[PDB]
Amino acid sequence: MNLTEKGTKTAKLSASDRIIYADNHLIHGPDDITAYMKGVCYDAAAYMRYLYNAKISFDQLTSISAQNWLPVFKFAEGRMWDGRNSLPGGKAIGFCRVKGMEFFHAAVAVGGTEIRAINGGLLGAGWLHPVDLRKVLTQKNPDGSFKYDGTDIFVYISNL
Structure with missing residues (x-):
């Protein structure tokens, strides 16, 4: 997927900091996932799994789009x-x-x-x-x- 400047900065946080970031800004708001990545339902979901330390490389995050997440x-x-x-x-x-x-x-x-x-x-x-x-x-x-x-x-x- 494509990331925003803010989505790139957030994605390159350590695994620990990414979890804390998701908890404080995204899973319960007040931020909108669209401020982090330019994708659709699957990319929003993949971006959040990546923040929670799922088995997704940064390269997969920035090269897999939409239905290719399936x-x-x-x-x-x-x-x-x-x-x-x-x-x-x-x-x-x-x-x-x-x-x-x-x-x-x-x-x-x-x-x-x-x-x-x-x-x-x-x-x-x-x-x-x-x-x-x-x-x-x-x-x-x-x-x-x-x-x-x-x-x-x-x-x-x-x-x-």
Whole structure:
């Protein structure tokens, strides 16, 4: 992804300082992830995982863009959200159509069932406008999918 001047400075902090930085400026606001990187939902999620010391090199951060994060997140290899329990703070949350497991959105868990994201409409339309998944994904199917916008989706917690 492309970084801003501020996103570059923040990315080159030590692993320790990056965690402290995310906690103080981003996971609960008041900063907007768009002030750090110029990407879309997947890049916002990857940037936050990188700050929390995920297995992402600076070179991967500054060369992988948008959907190319999908083989790094490996969402379908993670834990399915059961629709009721808390999401682990700072983790990447992936949303896919059941049919073909086609991922269309990524968010960041910020506590309980709340998420921050960009470019996701009802699943997060701005980093500073958190969404409670329990308010949006209320109807759960026998397969563990949820009814969303006329179709069925899975919710996965990336291990990244």
